[PDB]
Amino acid sequence: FDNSTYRNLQHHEYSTYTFLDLNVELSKFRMPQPSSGRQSPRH
């Protein structure tokens, strides 16, 4: 154990698409979305 170093260095390796790649990866973990019964409020 030690309080010497810094444990948040990983965000040094983040690119322009990292957030959306993570969203794509999590896409398969979700549950089916609820539906309002329309395709759009203008349908």
């Binding site: 309002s36 019964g37 329309r38 409020p41 203008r42």
Partner: protein
């Protein structure tokens, strides 16, 4: 300029009720046409309806 020959072109009378105007016209010998008062009907306003979950009343902009 704009010229007229009738002396009643500017005559407008104010009355509290329709019956008063009808009585005045009748006693003065004028034949008249009466139009019923038009009143806007009460309306149902809902600010929340601007953000409906499944209705068409949800607004796309504010």
């Amino acid at each position: 300029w704009s010229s007229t020959a009738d002396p009643l072109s500017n005559l407008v009378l104010t009355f509290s009720t329709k019956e008063d105007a009808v009585a005045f016209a009748e006693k003065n010998g004028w034949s008249f046409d009466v139009e019923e008062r038009k009143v806007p009907k009460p309306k149902s306003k809902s600010y929340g309806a601007n953000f409906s979950w499944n209705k068409r009343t949800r607004v796309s902009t504010k």
